[PDB]
Structure formats: structure tokens, C-alpha cells
Design a protein around this ligand. Structure first.
Ligand SMILES: CCC1=C(C)C2=CC3=N/C(=C\c4[nH]c(/C=C5\NC(=O)C(C)=C5CC)c(C)c4CCC(=O)O)C(CCC(=O)O)=C3CCN2C1=O
Ligand SMILES: CCC1=C(C)C2=CC3=N/C(=C\c4[nH]c(/C=C5\NC(=O)C(C)=C5CC)c(C)c4CCC(=O)O)C(CCC(=O)O)=C3CCN2C1=O
Ligand SMILES: [Ca+2]
Ligand SMILES: [Ca+2]
Lengths: 479, 479
């Protein structure tokens, strides 16, 4: 139900600014927020053309519209206002907000240099997360400023935090995917900054509802005043947050996480600070990408060393199998190739168990089980019990596996094993709950992670797939 | 001779600031530039302790000294001065410069957002070089602002340029290594920013010459006022530049290039702008690193596809050689593995020539030549004539080679070929000249690049070394 709600066309804004829609062609007013008259101090009804009279910035706007710069910004000093417009197809969407009480742009610039210094310093990622979380908590002045890292299921967990102490510390906690639904995650991938200064605000409509130029409702994906999904506002109430301001951390065109800010009282944030909070969220995004690409390479090369040794060992050996387990050197490498505590090489009824494997009978029952599934190339799981309950009786030694068929449906198998790792995912409220209205309970929750191994990396899987290739070629050669 | 000159201990500064050295222990004056009295408006002789009287910022300095932040900055409003200190072992090195006539820090911040936008946009590297070159030429206001990219010999060439037109456009030109000597390149790796506002400045000494605390001359590696090598000042004269300001572009702890600024008249630049010019030079440094790591990976994976096909073809084939050249598919792949126009597989007197190779006799004479050299693993050159003059008579088809011995000193060879590429390295003055005093002539120069191929990439060499590994293993297996 949640996934289906269109959050980008509320036909309404928040109370803390005004909105004016006008046509590229002649800058004629097509739509407007009802409160516009309050900020602009001018009526200009639907059909009216904007002139140097009503809008003294009309000259610099017309200029910006012909240019490439994707967003407009003007300080209406005359009226103490921060103007800002963007392009939506053939439309120009003007947003007006009260300017922030003179902040040092040098101070902003400053703390945006300590990050830029600490970032290119190339220290621990955890440090960088906190050393960004902090500067944002500094320049914003919210009661709580957490960095939030999405996992692959689209749950996330808090990996850094700053805050006065006026709001509870959520550090180290999982929240479920449904808390930031798909259409929300997507919107935040392309619009990297959002603010809700008062949660109890009264939604200001846009009239007409239907833009006369396009013929549809106004698309508000890039409207920074856009009125937020009511269902989220209840969430914020249940959490005891009057204000919030989140920034998207996008790494390689995918949403990595959020810099999320919250306040116990209502809280606003100047156009400038918002623009420095995105800068910090970008600066970090660069670091993260490099940290991730450098970690992968440095693993890929590491595993590469092992595979080059095993590849040479199998070629050099007569029976070849003793290239994989001919001595302590070969056996330890087979296990290090994928970062596994044990492995089983099965050639019909010719079983070989290296390191710490389940019993010969448990592997037999497992290979028949696999055969029943449609396993092409490799099959990898860090929780075997999920699909194979029987495995729950050797989770201690084999909670995760990487399994590969070697012979064309002739019961040949190389299977790696990884023990149970007892984790306590300390959740943030009960995740499974479905009220769907959001949950009132945010009381710290705890479930034990039973019969689940430390997870397989993409390099590990890639190293395994290459070894399959290495073997198949020789097993087809010797057959 | 040039390499030997110590540029980091001139015992002197430039005219446009003052310098004060004082001891960590008690902040007692140990050294001082003779002009200090002019800026500070106080004597404080050698032995004097700094107090809230002579230095009203003494309180915030003492604070900074205990902290981690590696540099100090204070606006002496009282005296219209920009103070800045750094740590040298047990010393604190204060530099004082006149503040810049009130510049918008929001304007600076601005053009440092258009770069940050255009950078994470991930467009063409050439665009990013110009779209940084420009913003620097903007915020500095020098007559010429070139980006300079070091090659592997430590020559460089101009790859972007902005400038009013008051100074000649050097775009696309090589300058020789000796123009930025080794100790200079090294210093600029660890101190990423330098300025010379007037070239004809009168060097202000530091007394005493010998710091009484350390017992040596003052080390001025991180002094932004440090007096520059006279031999460089003559260079600037011969070039017709009264001012300059260069920023180091450091990619992965190595000096990638310089953002260089020059002025026909004397030109100064505010402490702030300098700090934004480094930010731009950093922002870019991040882009470059990613561009380079993403290009490499995307080549490594590409070549990886070919090697996986050839590896499979040799394994699948009986005589195996026809895995490398059994048909158009195998032959084209052998040549695409290294990005070569031709190759020669030589197994004793069993010659095989693919694509566009020299004559069977020219390869014979080349293999004997190689045998005379000490070639372990592979030998790669993009100019064969350099070492093998005879090759100059088949440069059209083989100006560059990658050659690998396959059989243990048993005349087995896989050699790839790359044709001559007629390039005109348009130099910037005569490079070979040695006056060593610098050259007066900066008249655009031209030498033809004869008998030299498009250069081998590290991925290409890496793909070749892996194929050697693939073959040796089978040639030792079949032998
Ligand atoms: C690390 C913990 C954490 C969480 C879990 C969290 C949640 C969060 N939800 C946000 C947005 C939305 N949630 C929802 C919906 C739900 N949230 C829920 O918890 C539930 C049950 C729903 C509906 C199924 C929607 C529609 C939206 C889009 C609002 C808009 O239209 O702008 C948003 C973005 C809006 C904001 O910045 O406050 C957040 C960010 C704040 N935040 C956190 O700091
Ligand atoms: C793209 C073209 C280009 C070049 C080739 C160039 C040269 C350049 N030389 C610089 C510095 C030095 N050259 C030299 C020495 C030489 N330069 C020469 O041309 C020659 C012949 C020498 C001595 C052998 C030295 C010692 C230094 C260190 C100065 C210091 O002590 O701070 C420096 C750094 C000083 C500066 O920023 O002006 C540069 C940068 C400026 N610049 C350019 O824009
Ligand atoms: Ca993640
Ligand atoms: Ca280069």
C-alpha cells in the first residue's frame, strides 16, 4: 500500500515559504501557493506576466533560464527573502523562503575545509562518518545528526551520531526498509536534500490544482517546500521530533545512506547551510567511493595471489586434485581463496574434507538437496537453514556456503563452509509489526542472529567463479 | 647542479609579509624576519616572550598549539593583517600578511560549488581541467591560469588554460623536467600551494641565521613567504611574468600536475582565495583518481574477457597454438589482448605471423637481439629504434613491441607489434639547451616523433604477463 502513494504531487507546500509556477515562453503565472501574497506582497493572479515591477529579479531570472546552471538563487534584500527556481520541462518553479539571520559564509566555508582536509587525509571510514556527522550537527544545530547506511535489503543502521543529548542516541540500530519506502528512496536518489522545519505545519495548497500549461498536477520532485506524506509526519510525532533535515549520500548513482538531522523543538536552516550540508554529503560520497574501490581492488589482488598459486599447483600435479589439497600449503590456500573455515571436494563418491566441514553424511544429504535446486555456476548463502532446515544441526561449522558443480550433472562438487556467527542485530523498535499506520514503540529491540555466517563478498564469489572456470576446463580435458 | 640546490632553507622571505619563529615551551622569540617591526609594529627582540600585549591573539594561538589542526589562522582586524602559523618540530612559525580588501566569502564559496557540481557530474576529464582552470582564473584574476600534467619522464604539457589574453597561450606544449627540478617537485608534493606576487622583490633575511633552539638554519618547507630560488626568478623574467601562484594537484600521494597562474604585472591573492584554489585543486584530485581507477578497471575487465576466451581456446584445442591462431576469432583476440596491430608466435623455427608483422627475417634478427639482452618475464618499448637502430627500417609496422620468452632459453617467443605513430610534440622553447642558467627563448618549438608507437598501458602489460603465465604452464605440461 505504502509503495503506491505518490509523494511527489501533493498539490501543496509547507508554511515556511511560497511557490510560484510560470511558463518558459513569456513568464506568465500558471500556478501559485495560496500564501504567495504574504511573501511576495503582490497579488499577480493566474494569467499575469512577471515584470521588473512585481519581481525585480526578473532580469537575472530570464538570464539564468537561457543558461545551463540547473538551479537559480537570488537574495531579495528589499524583502529579506531567499528566492530559488528550477526547470520542470517547459516550466520554472520559483520557491521563496525568509533569509537566515546573517550567518558567516566564512564559518560555513571553514567547517567545510576541516571535512575536505580530514576526507583527503584518507583515514578510517568510521572516523569520516563521525567527522561529517559532527560538522553537520555544528552548522545545522539540530538536537541529533545521525549518518544512516542502507543494507542490501534496504533496512539501514546508524553508523555515526552527534547530538546535544536532547534526543535519544540511536547509534548501532537497524530500522526496517518500510520506514523509507521505495518511491521515497528513489526521489532521494535524484533530489539529495529535504527539510521539515515544523511537523504540525498546515498544508498550503497550489491553485489551480491542474497546471493549465501542462494539463497535469504540478510535479514537485525538485520542490524543496513540497508538503511531505502525512504517514511520515505521524512517524516523526511517535518519535518526538518537531523538525528534521536529511541529505542523501549517493555513491555511484545509488543511494548509499542519509545524513539525517532531528530537533525536539521546531528548527529551520538557511539556504546556504543546506547548500554546505549537501557539499559535506558529496565530499564524503567521494571518499566512500574510493574507500570501497580501493578495498575491493586490495582484496581482488590478494585473492588473485592465491588463485595464481592454486592454478599453478593443479597444472603442475599429475592427479591435479593435490594441487588443491596435496599438503598444508595447498589446503590452506583452497580455504583462503574464498575466506572459508572448511571445504568439501566431492568427485562422485570420492569425498575430500579440508579444515572444518560437516560430516561426510551431512554433505551427501546437502549435495542431493542442491541437485534438486537449479544451481548454474555457483550458489552462495550466509544462512543455509533459511532454505535447508536440516542444516540447523551443523550451523556451528556451516551456516554459510559457496557451492559449485564441476562435472556436467555427474555429481562433482567443490563446496566451501563458514561457521555460525552469533550476532545481536539491536533493532530500533519491533520491525515485523504492521499497524499500514507506523509504530508508536521505538523501544530498543533485540533478536539473536542464529545459524547465520559472516557474509560473502563480491571478490570472494568472483574468485570462486574463476576457480570453477579453471577446474571445469581441466575436468573436461581429463574426461 | 640544479638538483643539489637547497630551496627550503634560503634564510630569507619575500617583501609581502613578516615571519616570527618562537619555541613551543614558553613562546619565546628565537628568530624573526628583519621587516617584522614594520607589520607587528613592535620590536620584541630575540629572547623576548610573546604576551597578550605584543600579540593579542596569543590566547587563541596557545589553544591551537595544543590541538590537532595542523595550521593556525587569525584575522588581526586591529592592524588589518592575516596571521597564520604552522608547527616545525618544537617550533611555531608565524607568517603575517596584509588582509585582502573585503572579498565575498559567499562568492568564493559559490564558484567552489560550480566545480563541486561539475566534478561529481563525472563529465570528460578535459572539461573538468578547463572547468577548474577557469574558476581559478576567476577567483585569482591572474592574466594566465594553465593546468600542467606531468608525464613519466617529469616533462609536462599544458592540458587546460584560461587568461584575459595579456600573456601568450601555451596550451598543448611540452616543457622539460629541468624546469621544475626534483627537490622542487618533492617540496610541492608536501606543500601544495606557492605564490610569488612580485618577481623583483628584495629578499628579507631571518636573524639570527642559526635558530638558537634547534642549532640549524630554519627549515622553511611549509613557509608560504619563503624566498624562492633566484634561478627560477630569472626564468620568470625571461617569460615576462611579474607574478605567479601555483597549486599542486596531488593524486594518490604523487604530484599529478600544477594549477599554475601568471600575471604580466605584479599580483597578490588573499589568504582565503589561496585556500579555495587548494580546495579546487583537491576537488579535481578526487575526480582524477576516480576517472583513472574507473578507466583502468573498465580496461582490465575488457581485456579479461579476451584472455578468458583465449585461455579456454588453448585448453580446448589439441595442438593448443590454434587456440591463439586457429581462425579469425582466435587471431583477432590474440591482437586485441594487448591492443596490437600484429604478433609473431615463434617456436624454434616454427614461425607464425598474425595481422601486420615485420618480415620473417626481421623477426629472426630481432629474437637473436632480444636473446643478447637479459629479458626476464617481458620486455616492452614504444620506440624500438632507441636500442635497436636496425628496427628503423620497419618502424611503419613495428615501432612498439611487447616480447615474451615462453620456453626456458629454448628460442620460444610471443611478440606483439605496434606501428609508427607520426606525432609532433610541439615543445615550449628548445628543451635540450643547457645554459645551468635558464633559457631566454620560449619561442614555440617542433620535433617530429619518428619511429615511435602509441604507448603500452599497465593493463595491457598485465594482460600479456598473465598470458605468459597461461602458456609457460602448458608448454612445461606438453614438454
Ligand atoms: C535512521 C532513522 C531514520 C529513519 C528510519 C528515518 C525515516 C525517514 N522516513 C522518511 C520519509 C518517509 N517515510 C515515509 C513512509 C513511512 N515511513 C514509515 O516509517 C512508514 C511506516 C511509512 C509508510 C509505510 C514516507 C512516505 C516518507 C517520504 C516523506 C516525503 O514524502 O517527503 C524520511 C525522510 C524525511 C526526513 O528527512 O525527515 C526519513 C528520514 C528520517 N529517518 C531517520 O533518521
Ligand atoms: C607549465 C609551465 C610552467 C613551468 C615550466 C613552470 C615552471 C616552474 N618552475 C618552478 C619552480 C622552480 N624552478 C626552479 C629551477 C629551474 N627552473 C628552470 O626553468 C630552470 C632551468 C631551473 C634550474 C635548473 C626552481 C629551483 C624552482 C623552485 C622555486 C622555489 O624555490 O620555490 C615553478 C614553481 C614556482 C611558481 O609557482 O612560480 C614553476 C611553476 C610555473 N611554471 C609553469 O607554469
Ligand atoms: Ca551499505
Ligand atoms: Ca600525467
Amino acid at each position: 500500500s505504502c509503495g503506491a502513494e505518490p509523494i511527489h504531487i501533493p498539490g501543496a507546500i509547507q508554511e515556511h515559504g511560497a511557490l510560484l509556477v510560470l511558463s518558459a515562453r513569456e513568464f506568465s503565472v500558471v500556478q501559485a501557493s495560496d500564501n504567495l501574497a504574504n511573501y511576495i506582497g503582490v497579488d499577480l493572479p493566474i494569467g499575469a506576466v512577471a515584470t521588473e515591477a512585481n519581481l525585480p529579479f526578473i532580469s537575472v531570472l530570464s538570464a539564468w533560464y537561457s543558461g545551463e546552471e540547473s538551479n537559480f538563487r537570488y537574495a531579495w534584500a528589499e524583502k529579506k527573502l531567499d528566492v530559488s527556481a528550477h526547470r520542470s520541462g517547459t516550466l520554472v518553479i520559483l520557491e521563496v523562503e525568509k533569509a537566515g539571520v546573517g550567518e558567516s559564509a566564512e564559518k560555513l566555508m571553514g567547517e567545510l575545509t576541516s571535512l575536505a582536509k580530514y576526507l583527503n587525509s584518507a583515514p578510517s571510514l568510521e572516523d569520516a562518518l563521525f567527522r561529517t556527522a559532527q560538522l553537520v550537527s555544528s552548522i545545522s544545530g539540530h538536537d541529533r545528526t545521525l549518518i544512516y547506511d542502507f543494507g542490501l535489503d534496504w533496512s539501514g543502521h546508524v553508523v555515526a551520531e552527534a547530538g546535544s543529548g536532547a534526543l535519544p542516541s540511536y547509534l548501532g540500530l537497524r530500522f526496517p526498509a518500510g520506514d523509507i519506502p521505495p518511491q521515497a528512496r528513489q526521489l532521494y536518489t535524484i533530489n539529495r536534500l529535504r527539510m521539515i522545519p515544523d511537523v504540525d505545519y498546515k498544508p498550503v495548497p497550489i491553485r489551480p490544482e491542474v497546471n493549465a500549461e501542462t494539463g497535469a498536477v504540478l510535479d514537485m520532485s525538485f520542490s524543496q517546500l513540497r508538503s511531505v506524506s502525512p504517514v511520515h509526519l505521524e512517524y516523526m510525532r511517535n518519535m518526538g521530533t518537531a523538525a528534521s533535515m536529511s541529505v542523501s549520500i549517493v555513491v555511484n548513482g545509488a543511494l548509499w545512506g542519509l545524513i539525517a538531522c532531528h530537533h525536539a523543538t521546531p528548527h529551520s536552516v538557511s539556504l546556504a547551510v543546506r547548500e554546505a550540508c549537501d557539499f559535506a554529503a558529496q565530499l564524503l560520497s567521494m571518499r566512500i567511493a574510493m574507500e570501497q574501490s580501493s578495498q575491493d581492488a586490495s582484496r581482488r589482488v590478494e585473492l588473485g595471489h592465491i588463485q595464481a598459486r592454486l592454478l599453478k599447483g593443479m597444472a603442475a600435479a599429475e592427479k591435479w586434485v593435490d594441487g588443491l589439497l596435496g599438503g598444508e600449503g595447498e589446503r590452506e590456500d583452497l580455504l583462503k581463496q574464498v575466506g572459508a573455515d572448511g571445504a568439501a571436494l566431492v568427485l562422485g563418491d570420492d569425498y575430500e574434507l579440508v579444515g572444518n566441514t560437516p560430516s561426510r553424511e551431512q554433505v551427501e544429504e546437502l549435495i542431493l538437496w542442491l541437485g534438486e535446486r537449479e544451481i548454474a555456476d555457483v550458489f552462495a548463502t550466509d544462512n543455509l537453514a533459511g532454505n535447508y532446515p536440516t542444516a540447523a544441526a551443523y550451523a556451528s561449522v556451516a551456516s554459510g556456503i559457496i557451492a559449485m558443480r564441476v562435472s556436467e550433472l555427474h555429481g562433482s562438487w567443490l563446496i566451501w563452509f563458514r561457521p555460525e556467527v552469533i550476532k545481536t542485530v539491536r533493532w530500533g523498535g519491533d520491525p515485523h509489526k504492521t499497524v499500514i499506520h507506523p509504530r508508536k514503540s521505538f523501544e530498543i529491540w533485540k533478536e539473536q542472529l542464529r545459524n547465520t555466517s559472516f557474509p560473502w563478498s563480491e571478490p570472494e564469489l568472483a574468485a570462486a567463479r574463476e576457480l570453477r572456470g579453471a577446474i571445469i576446463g581441466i575436468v573436461l580435458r581429463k574426461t
